[PDB]
Design an enzyme around this catalytic site. Structure first.
Site, PDB file in Angstrom:
ATOM      1  N   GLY A  76     -12.937  -1.788  41.199  1.00  0.00           N
ATOM      2  CA  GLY A  76     -12.351  -1.526  42.496  1.00  0.00           C
ATOM      3  C   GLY A  76     -12.866  -2.336  43.671  1.00  0.00           C
ATOM      4  CB  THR A  77     -11.668  -2.166  47.204  1.00  0.00           C
ATOM      5  OG1 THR A  77     -10.416  -2.860  47.278  1.00  0.00           O
ATOM      6  CG2 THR A  77     -12.399  -2.213  48.531  1.00  0.00           C
ATOM      7  CB  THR A  78     -16.809  -4.445  47.684  1.00  0.00           C
ATOM      8  OG1 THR A  78     -18.113  -4.174  48.221  1.00  0.00           O
ATOM      9  CG2 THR A  78     -16.085  -5.433  48.565  1.00  0.00           C
TER      10      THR A  78
END
Lengths: 244, 244, 233, 242, 111, 243, 241, 198, 250
Positions: free
Chosen positions: A30-32
């Site tokens: 996933g996105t950071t």
């Protein structure tokens, strides 16, 4: 034999719980997102990948508030994140209703912890596909936390998870060494904006949108608020500048 | 999920047979043999105690002959513990009937009820059946002396003479050979011992390895009497019948 | 691999995937295309109705949830009935209890949360349908895209279903243009039909084949089918 | 094993698909909708000459203005019919009017996906999908005569004509060419009688086949054997006529 | 002890013309000898050309009207926007009222 | 058949692999702990390891205050540890409410052991990968150490150790008691008992400790408390002026 | 608690648990029913895997649901009891609420429903039974004969058989039963029934039981002799040629 | 209340029950049969609360018929009465008890003797030569206590009842519109269609 | 959540064996030896206190438990399973007997209760059989002294003397040699100690052995006086010292 990784509450011969580990893979994919504890508050920031020009800018907010003093952000399966905040909200309402005082961050953390740990006790449920960074201000200070799909969590000075967690952790460790006295909310907001920009390299292929929120005894009165307008742009710039 | 570990104790084989029932019956075939012989003036129940020791207390033992009513008893072949569960409910049903109609329960009604309970574990619930087979010896004023048999499937039938447990084929052939409609209790008692005597998997047939019971209508009275023979009583009848 | 980790929604694959959820998403792609786009005054839904035989009807793809909200479906019709019905109740609740019309953004959150529950527990199955929600509330016109995974996004326009990618690129191009079609529904609708025809291939949109719905400033969510859409073909 | 409500990698529900297969093995059923009424015919298909053909009930009445035909595991259709009859009667009790054919159909299709071993959405206590498709035909003031095909999938389509069962692909192709917006009730009758004869294994007579219709004037009626036999004779004559 | 009912006064009148119909009502809402409002509408337009009024205990009258309007809404949702004929609205209301046969809506309703 | 290794049912050898693999999980934290009884106190030492520089050291602990009088140290993953701590606290509070007196250490142990025994028998409950060491100064029994495992087993100890290098600590302590001939550290102050504790921790593990490498908990009459980095340092200094 | 879907669909559209339920019926002792012009006869064969039984008490194959309706079956005995009980209960409930006993078709549709239900409810296997239900509707003289199977399907027959070797006996009936002139006598109807069973019973005077049902709750079971008499007159029909 | 009388003679049990059904100000029916046949040799008469009365009787009837079919046997009178007593004794402690009193007259084919059972709504059961419910006993018991004999013929029983009914029609304030009489013996249950003037 | 294991985990194999029961029995086999001997005026049950570590306090772990003041139990197999079984037994003696009849249950009936609890873990959904075998010794007015054995299947049988666990075969044999129907309690205690020695590898003293008896009434163990009919418990665990005194006359 094998098959120890097909059911959720099963201990493998080496004492692990593979489904919880596979859940982590969903988180790393996933996105950071990060969190920074400052001298009197905490700051949250996250990377929002702009899939296309069709996404209305600034609209799909990811950071969530719990009660009025807690911020939560996560990486992984977004829906699982919301599910956890909903519980957190009920968890917080219940606490306030009985004890009158809004829920302390440490207490709130364990509420989330026990709930997540609970989803690793049966094969009739799946672990959470998210790592969560949350915190706020309470009776005695600011508190930052990160909660893994295993239900494990600890208090942090800074924290990151997702695609570019390593870059982020790296940047975070720098700040920790170069500021033993403590970063200010104002500063942490900028620093945060930078760390997301940097860590965005591990996904430099897609364009993104920055999102920040904070809870500072002095800057927000101890209430969780989103960083908007001027203060936001000022941080975006501070980043765009140090990205070159 | 859990589905993975479900044995599915209540399904049909491609041949239309019930696995569990069949396997339970197989289990019963290794149980001490029990015989039931109905005479004109009474009924005889005899059973062979499976496994014994010098230290086993026989005076205080009972593993095959149980009293259900003052007019009904059963001989057990299979898991003792399973039998006891069924026997207790059988005893309760008998009393419910008594309290409702103020009459002792007709022998078939009690047998059909116990068999219906067994049939249940065969069609729903997902539980293993009872590894038990019963020989029912009882008396009522509508059919007089009666002998029944019920097995894991929940089926029951009436007999003049029958056996359950080990070597039933051998036992049945011997009984079908010397049984006669006009027999007398004393005759039947002797037939029973001879049958067991020739089907035992043990060296000799001693008293310490037997349980005996008779349901007679003692001429000098007019009522029905059940007699569960005591160690010494079995030892006696064992000498008289010429088996010493 | 996959085969051992796709027997139910409660299992993560070794890479962190949820195949049952993905297989559900597949049902959408197999669904007929539908498009959604909005200006600052209106929101439009254009959906291609699919027919079984030439003796059959073209299955309805647009559902009204309230006077200010509605959606278009792609995938398992039954699941859209369930989800739209739930959206109808939620809008109804907001009105009856708070005398407030339900925010389109709030509806999105409610759909996400209902879909999520069906992806973490044993026994259930994910919903196998995609939804495009449009509505006019206290903050203007809105368009939302709902995926069975539980992911809901707000956009200016989009499309879901078979060959949806055609219309989606067209809109991602026509963006600066239609986003300004304020105060002129007909223009917005035509732009919608032009985006949807970018996903045609089989046939061409006919009268009993095209379905359109609009909502906005002074326009209660209304649905146009047949003769009523003739002036757009 | 595997869940009863599991998705195939193609995005379909196994049990529902496998359900459609059992339906293919069922007796043929055909429906034709004209501006003069809707006709519904079925293939009795008794399994032995000793079986009394008239005890075969594959065409039933839902309400005076709604009737239906079934194809597949017919025993599975009983609770569906019951639910339908109750729904229509209930609607009348609550609204002092007739239930619209579409509404009645939608109600039946709502039972459809209510199966599983614990699906998180309500309390769908039913182990498997229904193994039978239904042709629901009726009339109502708002949309006149109507024919619907309700499947175990929960979806229902409206048709001008439709065939379900063993000879459906074949029969449907026939209906495609034969149907036109101006068929008369009598035409539809012969037409249904004809297609059944083509796909039926047995030689169609008034004992192994049954007709019925629903008209605004007299409602749903099942043609008795004598009435159909004549219509059969009338078909043979018009066919031998060229 | 708590009395779940009250009387808000008011009077309503309904007359059916050959091809028209009227439903009137005063706009006074009272409690004992006090006036709560000199203008509190009591006759409502419920859509589908149906006007209704539930006079008596206002809290009950409001709930009923509110419940019926919502009934009209779903009627459309469930029956392809079909219009609710007044005879059908009537049977519907009968069921709404009879549902509380043992804790009634203390109102006299007219449509 | 091969599933007799996924749920808690017997294996043909009469074993419960899931319980065995649960025992394996207890060493996942690579932390060692030990407990010893004083003359009128009970001490528990546990290694403290904080790898990540981004962590707030103050929030990293495997020692818990269960009640005013009972302390518990956990060997195993933190989430299962916290699940055991909450339950123990709830249990300790309820016992007081219902029976009117503080739940004894051994009783709380038995209760937790029974709860474990259950996950061992019911197939839907997985065991917890932890070992619980309860300590206090019971009003009836005096200094007490009771420990429970994933098997639902429990017993009291004169002293005990738990973790990867458990065996070394154990033999070290065993030796000391074979020598002293008494079943406790004959010291009047808990400070010295804490020192004895840390000292033998070092000897057995052959390692030196700073103030942030340890974690200490003490139980005295009517109270159980954990020491601070500084309370510990003062301890480390004292032991230094002896070697 | 147990609600596993035991009866589900397989790729080819079959429900094996129902299919296997039929296999259990094939294994059961044969049963036949034929309707005359003024009666219905039910015949059943008696196994012989074991013989030394007490015929007085051993459960008979033909059961009365009410005074005007009987039910026979082929399949699992334990399972048949559940159906019989439910049928008997429903018979009384019907009389209690409608103030009239059940028609044969009604009673049949009921039993069938119970069976169908067990084919799509969690945690339960279908009934390994098939039944023949016969009798006379209240105040009616027209004979009724119905048959039900595991799936839940049912229908009426002029004559029908179920169980092992039913294939054989059905053939006999199909080429020995004229709908034009049904056994106009209780006698010739019982004979046709015995004849059909002899094709598979292989000399079994004590292996063949018959029950005769006439209008107005007139139901009676024949004795060994009465039946044995029919067998005798039949073996002669053959030898006399 | 209505008139419920029972007399057990030498070889049969006779039950007499008033025919009137009064609802407030009017006598709605004068031909009501307050009885239900439970089995070929067992009859039950009843009186009590308006609806409860028949509902109970029919409920009992259903259960006995079901038992008769299941067992292809007829329960003894004593058995049927214990079943009924228990049903009432349950009802007495339920939410809304059955307010019904009954007389059960049956001929025990096994013992070859008639039996009369009296059970009130509380589940109070007693076996008697003759009995009644309500006020009926008050006017008739002195006549029965006097003329009753264990060896009476059915004909003598009917004469003794007639005497009872006459006393009732003389001193009782209400017009119960006569009684319907039924005999239960070894051959079943039959109704004496001629008591309007026997 | 929610236990969805509503089906049996113990089922019949084609051979007719009940796997889980068998495996449970195997677990019993690996357990430390325990035994019981009946004398004319008492009963003795004993086992070895296999201290799992020298730091452990063996006293804080009793393998011999009092179920009622006239009944005791001992086992071989899984200790945790035994512990909960004792809790359940003590409670059932009350709930199903003392609270109804006002007196403690007779040995056979309490044994029967325990057996039922075990049988259920053999058929109920979602559980495994108990991995233990118990030897229960007691006394009651109308049955005198008795000794029973209860196995994982739930079956139980009366014994004059017997042993279970590790060296049960050897021990049972040694018991058959020394047992007679004229043994006095002390004699049984003696025989018990001898039998147990053959099963013990290391130290054999009153701190490594656990032994209790069902004998005369111990009025000194009642806790109060004033009620003639109350004479005290018949169950009594021997003390470390009491055992050593008898080991010298070994």
């Amino acid at each position: 034999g094998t098959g120890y990784d097909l059911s959720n509450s099963v201990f493998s011969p080496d004492g692990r719980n593979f489904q919880v580990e596979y859940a982590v893979k969903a988180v790393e994919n996933g996105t950071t997102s990060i969190g920074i504890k400052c001298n009197d508050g905490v700051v949250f920031a996250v990377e929002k990948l702009i899939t296309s020009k069709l996404l209305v800018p600034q609209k799909n907010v990811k950071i969530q508030v719990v009660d009025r003093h807690i911020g939560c952000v996560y990486s992984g399966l977004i829906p699982d994140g919301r599910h956890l905040v909903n519980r957190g909200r009920e968890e917080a309402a219940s606490f306030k209703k009985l004890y009158k005082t809004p829920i302390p961050i440490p207490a709130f953390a364990d509420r989330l912890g026990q709930y997540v740990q609970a989803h690793t006790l049966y094969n009739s449920v799946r672990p959470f596909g998210v790592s969560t960074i949350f915190g706020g201000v309470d009776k005695n200070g600011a508190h930052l936390y990160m909660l893994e799909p295993s239900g494990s969590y600890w208090g942090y000075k800074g924290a990151a998870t997702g695609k570019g967690r390593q870059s982020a952790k790296a940047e975070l460790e720098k700040l920790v060494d170069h500021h033993p006295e403590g970063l200010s909310a104002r500063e942490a907001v900028k620093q945060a904006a930078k760390i997301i920009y940097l860590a965005h390299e591990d996904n430099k292929e897609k364009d993104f949108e920055l999102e920040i929120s904070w809870c500072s005894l002095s800057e927000t009165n101890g209430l969780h608020k989103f960083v908007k307008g001027d203060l936001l742009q000022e941080a975006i710039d501070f980043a765009q500048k140090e990205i070159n | 999920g859990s589905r993975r570990y479900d044995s599915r104790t209540t399904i049909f084989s491609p041949e239309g047979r019930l696995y569990q029932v069949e396997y339970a019956l197989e289990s019963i075939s290794h149980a001490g043999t029990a015989i039931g012989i109905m005479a004109s003036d009474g009924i005889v129940l005899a059973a062979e105690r499976k496994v014994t020791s010098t230290l086993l207390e026989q005076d205080t033992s009972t593993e095959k002959l149980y009293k259900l009513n003052d007019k009904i008893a059963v001989a057990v072949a299979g898991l003792t513990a399973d039998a006891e569960i069924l026997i207790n409910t059988a005893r309760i049903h008998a009393q419910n009937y008594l309290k409702t109609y103020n009459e002792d329960i007709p022998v078939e009604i009690l047998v059909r009820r116990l068999s219906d309970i067994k049939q249940g574990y065969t069609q729903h619930g997902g539980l293993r059946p009872f590894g038990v087979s019963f020989i029912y010896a009882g008396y009522d004023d509508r059919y007089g002396y009666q002998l029944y048999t019920s097995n894991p499937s929940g089926n029951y039938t009436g007999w003049k003479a029958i056996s359950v447990g080990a070597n039933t084929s051998a036992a049945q052939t011997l009984l079908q050979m010397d049984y006669k409609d006009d027999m007398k209790v004393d005759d039947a008692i002797e037939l029973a011992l001879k049958t067991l005597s020739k089907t035992t998997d043990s060296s000799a047939l001693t008293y310490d390895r037997l349980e005996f019971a008779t349901i007679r209508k003692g001429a000098n009275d007019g009522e029905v009497y059940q007699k569960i023979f005591k160690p010494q009583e079995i030892k006696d009848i064992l000498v008289k019948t010429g088996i010493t | 691999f996959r085969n051992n980790y796709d027997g139910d929604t409660v299992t993560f694959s070794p890479t962190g995937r949820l195949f049952q959820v993905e297989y559900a998403l597949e049902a959408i792609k197999q669904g007929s295309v539908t498009v959604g786009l909005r200006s600052n005054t209106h929101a439009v839904l254009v959906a291609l109705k699919r027919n079984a035989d030439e003796l059959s009807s073209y299955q309805k793809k647009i559902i009204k949830c309230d006077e200010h909200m509605g959606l278009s479906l792609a995938g398992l019709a039954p699941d859209a009935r369930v989800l739209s019905n739930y959206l109808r109740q939620q809008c109804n609740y907001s009105s009856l209890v708070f005398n407030r019309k339900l925010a389109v953004e709030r509806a999105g959150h409610l759909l996400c949360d209902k879909a999520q529950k069906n992806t973490q527990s044993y026994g259930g199955r994910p919903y196998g349908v995609g939804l495009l929600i449009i509505g006019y509330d206290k903050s203007g016109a809105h368009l939302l895209e709902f995926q069975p995974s539980g992911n809901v996004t707000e956009l200016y326009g989009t499309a879901i279903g078979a060959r949806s990618q055609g219309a989606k690129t067209y809109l991602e191009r026509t963006l600066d243009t239609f986003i300004k079609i304020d105060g002129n529904p007909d223009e917005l609708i035509k732009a919608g039909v032009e985006a949807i025809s970018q996903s045609l291939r089989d046939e061409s949109l006919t009268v009993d084949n095209l379905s359109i719905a609009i909502v906005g400033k002074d326009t209660p969510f209304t649905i146009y089918d047949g003769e009523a859409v003739a002036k757009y073909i | 094993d595997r869940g009863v409500s599991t998705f195939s990698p193609e995005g379909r529900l196994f049990q529902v698909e496998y359900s459609l297969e059992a339906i293919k093995l069922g007796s043929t059923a055909i429906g034709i909708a004209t501006k003069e009424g809707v006709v519904l015919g079925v293939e009795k298909r008794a399994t032995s000459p000793l079986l009394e053909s008239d005890s075969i009930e594959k065409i039933v009445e839902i309400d005076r203005h709604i009737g239906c035909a079934m194809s597949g595991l017919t025993a599975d259709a009983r609770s569906m019919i019951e639910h339908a009859r109750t729904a229509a009667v209930t609607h009348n009790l609550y609204y002092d009017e007739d239930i619209n054919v579409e509404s009645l159909t939608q109600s039946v299709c709502d039972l459809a996906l209510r199966f599983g071993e614990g699906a998180s959405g309500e309390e769908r206590l039913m182990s498997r999908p229904f193994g039978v498709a239904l042709l629901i035909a009726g009339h109502d003031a708002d949309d006149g005569y109507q024919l619907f095909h309700a499947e175990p999938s929960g979806t229902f389509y409206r048709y001008n004509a439709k065939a379900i069962g063993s000879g459906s692909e074949g029969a449907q192709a026939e209906l495609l060419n034969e149907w036109h917006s101006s068929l008369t009730l009598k035409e539809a009758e012969l037409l249904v009688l004809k297609i059944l004869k083509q796909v039926m294994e047995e030689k169609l007579d008034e004992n192994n086949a049954q007709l019925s219709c629903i008209t605004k004037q007299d409602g749903f009626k099942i043609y008795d054997n004598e009435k159909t036999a004549e219509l059969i004779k009338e078909l043979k004559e018009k066919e031998a006529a060229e | 002890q708590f009395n779940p009912y009250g009387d808000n006064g008011g009077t309503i009148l309904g007359i059916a013309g050959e091809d028209f119909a009227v439903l009137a009502g005063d706009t006074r809402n009272i409690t004992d000898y006090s006036i709560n409002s000199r203008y509190e509408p009591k006759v409502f337009d419920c859509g589908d050309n149906i006007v209704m009024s539930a006079n008596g205990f206002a809290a009950d009258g409001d709930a009923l009207v509110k419940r019926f309007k919502n009934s009209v809404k779903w009627y459309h949702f469930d029956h392809n926007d079909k219009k609710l004929s007044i005879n059908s609205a009537a049977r519907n209301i009968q069921h709404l009222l009879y549902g509380k046969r043992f804790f009634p809506y203390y109102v006299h309703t007219i449509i | 058949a091969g599933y007799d290794r996924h749920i808690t049912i017997f294996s043909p050898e009469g074993r419960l692999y899931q319980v065995e693999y649960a025992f394996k999980a207890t060493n996942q934290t690579n932390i060692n702990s030990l407990a010893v009884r004083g003359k009128d106190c009970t001490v528990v030492i546990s290694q403290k390891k904080v790898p990540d520089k981004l962590l707030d050291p103050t929030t990293v602990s495997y020692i818990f205050c269960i009640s005013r009088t009972i302390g518990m140290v956990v060997n195993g993953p933190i989430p299962d540890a916290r699940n055991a701590a909450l339950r123990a606290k709830a249990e300790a509070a309820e016992f007081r409410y219902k029976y009117g007196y503080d739940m004894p250490c051994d009783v709380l142990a038995k209760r937790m052991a029974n709860l474990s025994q259950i996950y061992t028998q019911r197939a839907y409950m997985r065991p917890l990968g932890v070992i619980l060491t309860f300590v206090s100064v019971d009003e009836e029994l005096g200094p007490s150490i009771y420990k429970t495992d994933p098997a639902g087993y429990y017993v009291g100890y004169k002293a005990t150790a738990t973790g990867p290098k458990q065996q070394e600590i154990t033999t070290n302590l065993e030796n000391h008691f074979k020598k002293s001939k008494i079943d406790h550290i004959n010291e009047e102050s808990w400070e010295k008992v804490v020192e004895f504790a840390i000292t033998h921790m070092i000897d057995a593990l052959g390692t030196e400790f700073s103030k942030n490498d340890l974690e200490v908990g003490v139980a005295t009459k009517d109270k159980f408390f954990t020491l601070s980095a500084e309370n510990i340092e003062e301890r480390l200094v004292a032991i230094a002026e002896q070697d | 608690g147990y609600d596993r879907a035991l009866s589900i669909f397989s790729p080819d559209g079959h429900i094996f648990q129902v299919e296997y339920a039929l296999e259990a019926v094939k294994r059961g002792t044969c049963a036949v029913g034929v309707k005359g012009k003024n009666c219905v006869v039910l015949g059943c064969e008696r196994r012989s895997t074991l013989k030394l039984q007490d015929t007085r008490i051993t459960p008979s194959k033909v059961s009365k649901i009410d005074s005007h309706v009987v039910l026979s079956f082929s399949g699992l005995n334990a399972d048949s009891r559940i159906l019989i009980e439910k049928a008997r209960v429903e018979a009384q409930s019907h009389r209690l609420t409608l103030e009239d006993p059940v028609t044969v078709e009604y009673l049949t549709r009921y039993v069938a429903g119970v069976q169908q239900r067990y084919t799509q409810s969690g945690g339960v296997r279908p009934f390994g039974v098939s039944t023949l239900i016969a009798g006379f509707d209240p105040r009616d003289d027209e004979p009724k004969l119905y048959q039900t199977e595991p799936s839940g399907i049912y229908s009426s027959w002029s004559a029908q058989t179920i169980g092992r070797n039913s294939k054989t006996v059905r053939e006999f009936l199909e080429k020995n039963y004229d709908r034009k002139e049904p056994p106009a006598t209780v006698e010739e109807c019982v004979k046709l029934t015995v004849r059909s069973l002899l094709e598979v019973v292989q000399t079994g005077a004590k292996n063949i039981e018959i029950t005769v049902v006439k209008p107005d709750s007139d139901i009676v079971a024949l004795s060994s002799e009465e039946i044995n008499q029919y067998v005798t007159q039949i073996e002669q029909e053959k030898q006399e040629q | 209340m209505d008139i419920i009388l029972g007399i057990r003679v030498q070889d049969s049990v006779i039950l007499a029950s008033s025919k009137a059904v009064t609802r407030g100000i009017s006598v709605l029916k004068d031909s009501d049969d307050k009885t239900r046949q439970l089995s070929p040799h067992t009859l039950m008469s009843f009186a009590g609360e308006a609806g409860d009365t028949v509902q109970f009787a029919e409920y009992i009837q259903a259960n006995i018929q079901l038992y008769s079919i299941r067992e292809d046997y007829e329960l003894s009178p004593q058995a049927v009465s214990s079943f009924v007593r228990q049903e009432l004794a349950k009802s007495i402690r339920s939410r809304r008890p059955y307010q019904v009193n009954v007389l059960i007259g049956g001929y025990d084919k096994k013992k070859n003797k008639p039996e009369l059972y009296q059970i009130d709504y509380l589940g109070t059961k007693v076996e008697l030569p003759y009995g009644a419910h309500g006020y009926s006993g008050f006017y008739t018991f002195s006549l029965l206590d006097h003329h009753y004999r264990p060896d009476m013929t059915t004909e003598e029983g009917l004469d003794l009842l007639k005497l009872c009914v006459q006393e009732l029609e003389k001193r009782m304030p209400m017009d119960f519109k006569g009684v319907i009489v039924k005999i239960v013996d070894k051959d079943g249950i039959r109704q004496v269609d001629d008591f309007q003037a026997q | 959540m929610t236990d969805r294991y509503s089906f049996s985990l113990t089922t019949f194999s084609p051979s007719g064996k009940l796997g889980q029961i068998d495996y449970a029995l195997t677990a019993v086999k690996q357990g430390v030896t325990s035994l019981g001997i009946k004398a004319t005026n008492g009963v003795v049950i004993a086992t070895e206190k296999k201290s799992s570590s020298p730091l452990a306090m063996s006293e804080t772990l009793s393998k011999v438990s009092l179920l009622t003041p006239d009944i005791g139990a001992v086992y071989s197999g899984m200790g945790p399973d035994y512990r909960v079984l004792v809790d359940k037994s003590r409670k059932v003696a009350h709930t199903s007997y003392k609270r109804i009849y006002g007196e403690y249950p007779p040995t056979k009936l309490l044994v029967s209760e325990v057996a039922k609890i075990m049988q259920e873990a053999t058929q109920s959904g979602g559980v495994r059989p108990f991995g233990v075998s118990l030897l229960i010794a007691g006394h009651d007015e109308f049955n005198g002294f008795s000794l029973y054995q209860v196995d994982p299947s739930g079956s139980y049988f009366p014994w004059k003397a017997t042993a279970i666990g590790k060296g049960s075969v050897a021990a049972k044999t040694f018991l058959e040699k020394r047992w007679n129907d004229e043994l006095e309690l002390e004699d049984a205690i003696h025989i018990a100690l001898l039998t147990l020695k053959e099963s013990v590898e290391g130290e054999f003293n009153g701190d490594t052995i656990e032994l209790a008896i069902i004998g005369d009434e111990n009025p000194d163990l009642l806790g109060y006086t004033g009620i003639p009919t109350d004479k005290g418990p018949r169950f009594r665990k021997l003390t470390s010292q009491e055992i050593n005194d008898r080991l010298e006359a070994l």
